[PDB]
Amino acid sequence: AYKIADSCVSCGACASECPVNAISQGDSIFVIDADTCIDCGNCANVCPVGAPVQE
């Protein structure tokens, strides 16, 4: 599991994209239920700026 890191702008276009919908806007930008994310590569594949990357 990763984070939506600071590369993220609040663009929205990954929330619904996660097969397990393990995403929402959280701290400031998008966020991941990292518990519940499995390292599937989707989201990371979709994000215009590849922000699904870790804390």
Which residues are annotated as part of the binding site for [4Fe-4S] cluster?
8, 11, 14, 18, 37, 40, 43, 47
Pick one of 27, 49, 54, 55: the residue that binds ligand SF4 (CB under 6 A): 49
Gap between the Cα atoms of 12 and 47, Å rounded: 10
Site for ligand SF4 contains 38 (CB under 6 A) = yes
Gap between the Cα atoms of 24 and 16, Å rounded: 9
Copy the structure tokens of residue 32.
Answer: 């991941």
Copy the structure tokens of residue 48.
Answer: 């215009």
Pick one of 12, 24, 26, 27: the residue that binds ligand SF4 (CB under 6 A): 12
Q: How many residues bind ligand SF4 (CB under 6 A)?
A: 29
